[PDB]
Structures are given as structure tokens and as C-alpha cells.
């Protein structure tokens, strides 16, 4: 993946879109198409990572830390879902997909 950066909340709009596309990998979990789930998750993850850092930098310092922490949890669960796909476990994939959805809602709530 190659990315072309964007400014404050042009990037939050794109982050919200990558976040939604991430919700969409459940179908890959259901068909158990692990490599597809991983490639899609990876791309979305790369966009999301870049745009959240951007949205964070242009955030009043009083709320940078808070978003940064929700952002950090999100990428931990995203990684964990990539790991679950890597080891081909419907169990773990389902668990981390769950945690990922909850972490996305948290970041979305702080967005908009
Ligand atoms: Zn910090």
C-alpha cells in the first residue's frame, strides 16, 4: 500500500471510511478466507493508521492523549485479528473481530 496524506478532518472522514471497511471483513471470517481477510485488514489498517495520527496531531492537547490511547487499543486488536487469521483460528478471529468492532466504535464516537 502507498498513501497520499490529507489535512485535519478530511482525514477523519477517510478514517471513518477505513473504519467501516474494517467492519466489513467479517465476511472473510465467515467464508474462512484468511488470506483475503489479512490483505484487506492490512490495507484498511494502513490508511486508518495514517489518518488517525493526522487527526491526533491537530487535536487540542487536552484530548490528544485520549484518542492516542483508543487508537493504540484499536491497532492492538487489529493486529490480534491479523494473528488469528495467520493461525487460521475461527475462535480467536471471532474474539478479536469482536474487540476490534468495540474499539472502532470508541474511536468513531470520539470522531465526527
Ligand atoms: Zn501520548
Swiss-Prot record:
Compartments reported by the entry: Plastid, Chloroplast thylakoid membrane
Origin superkingdom: Eukaryota
Coiled-coil boundaries: none
Family named by the database record: Belongs to the PsbQ family.
Protein name: Oxygen-evolving enhancer protein 3, chloroplastic
Organism of derivation: Spinacia oleracea (Spinach)
Gene name linked to the record: PSBQ
Segment of the intact protein contained: 121 to 232 of 232
Amino acid at each position: 500500500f502507498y498513501l497520499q496524506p490529507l489535512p485535519p478532518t478530511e482525514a477523519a472522514q477517510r478514517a471513518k471510511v477505513s473504519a467501516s471497511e474494517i467492519l466489513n471483513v467479517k465476511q472473510f471470517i465467515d467464508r474462512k478466507a484468511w488470506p483475503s481477510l489479512q490483505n484487506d485488514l492490512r490495507l484498511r489498517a494502513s490508511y486508518l493508521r495514517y489518518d488517525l495520527k493526522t487527526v491526533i496531531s491537530a487535536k487540542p492537547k487536552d484530548e490528544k492523549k485520549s484518542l492516542q490511547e483508543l487508537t493504540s487499543k484499536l491497532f492492538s486488536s487489529i493486529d490480534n485479528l491479523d494473528h488469528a487469521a495467520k493461525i487460521k483460528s475461527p475462535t480467536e478471529a471471532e474474539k478479536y473481530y469482536g474487540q476490534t468492532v468495540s474499539n472502532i466504535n470508541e474511536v468513531l464516537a470520539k470522531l465526527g
